[PDB]
């Protein structure tokens, strides 16, 4: 059995002063998540690019909580629907950082790309990335993932660039609203959102105000 | 370079004066064939360097300018680097070639309009507004020439006053221009008359063009 008592007011009231209807309660999902002991416990993923876009490293910085061990290994894996486009295979232990060392539970992992597809609100290319936390000998403990859309956002001589090309920004701002249901989103309001958004040819949305 | 005794005026009296070097190459085709050739850089440097040793102790004289309406060559970023080395105490600015190219401390266009933008090929006249936070652009726009007053004219000059007033770089401008370029000629009887282009018998003429 869980107890929840949930205040209505606190001192985090004080930094969420939104022009918008002031409810309380428990609005989004409640879930139960299993991990391993030892388990990844973060991953970041940056992508760059050469100067006209034609290659790009995918860079996976991935972290672990447990005990360290010499055959830990972590492989990420790059997806293009049922096709493999690159893969890495590396132990932990990241580059030295200072005079007392370096991390000892993290690895990077660095994946060439050939002429990725890139990713932009006009044509959202995305590339699936599988992030596998295994023995050497390829027993699989545990493996999250990602959606991965290559693109970079740049702002150069005053202008904002996505894949170097400068942006026109059609926003909308955008509160969690439903009339019947209040402050809590359902997947079918967000998807009936996002088409009447693009097809009124918008490319852009902020998340007012968080 | 104007009459010597115009600088002493302008002192005496108080108005800011550009100084402007005697090069004008416009007929030429492109404009700037004389100005790129490095064969006539000594008769243009010329034409600068005994400028500013003549006016360089004048205090009307605020700012330097290279010419006009001689596209822009090799020999303009020459001689503005001159000038620049020689007397450090005024900006020196030159229109050709696009009104702000590496030649110019100002930007210095003729006739860009306030709100309306006139894309010409490779020298193009941006609406003033707008051509003042292009990309990388920093510097202060001040018009050569604009409001061109000839016969009846000077419709929507206050678009102009209300722009430099509203935009800080927006530092106004020269209008063209003061004095109508009219000759006296005189009919059967002795009563003179204003005369134009092409009223001395030569031609080709641009006509009222001149007034
Ligand atoms: O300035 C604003 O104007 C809007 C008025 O409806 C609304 O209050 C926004 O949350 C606020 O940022
Ligand atoms: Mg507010
Ligand atoms: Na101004
Ligand atoms: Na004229």
Known sequence: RLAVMVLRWSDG?????????????????????????????????ATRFNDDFSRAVLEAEVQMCGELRDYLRVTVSLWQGETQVASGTAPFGGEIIDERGGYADRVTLRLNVENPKLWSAEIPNLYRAVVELHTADGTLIEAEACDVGFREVRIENGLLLLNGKPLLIRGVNRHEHHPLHGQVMDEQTMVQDILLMKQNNFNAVRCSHY | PNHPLWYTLCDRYGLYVVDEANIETHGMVPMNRLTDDP??????????????????????????????????????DALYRWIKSVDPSRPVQYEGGGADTTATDIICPMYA????????????????????????????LILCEYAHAMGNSLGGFAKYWQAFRQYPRLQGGFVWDWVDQSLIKYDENGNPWSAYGGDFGDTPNDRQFCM
């Not at chain 1, 004080?14 to 991990?35: N, T």
């Not at chain 2, 490779?122 to 292009?134: D, E, Q």
Request: glycine share 6%.
């Open chain 2, 39 to 76: 064969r006539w850089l000594p008769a243009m440097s010329e034409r600068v360097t005994r400028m500013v040793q003549r006016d360089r102790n004048h205090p009307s004289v605020i700012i330097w300018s290279l010419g006009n309406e001689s596209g822009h060559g090799a020999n303009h």
């Open chain 2, 113 to 140: 309009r306030v709100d309306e933008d006139q894309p010409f090929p490779a020298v193009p006249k941006w609406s003033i507004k707008k051509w003042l936070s292009l990309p990388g652009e920093t510097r202060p």
């Open chain 1, 13 to 45: 009231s004080y930094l969420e002063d939104q022009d918008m209807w002031r409810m309380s309660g428990i609005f989004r999902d409640v879930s139960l998540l299993h991990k391993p002991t030892t388990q990844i416990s973060d991953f970041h993923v």
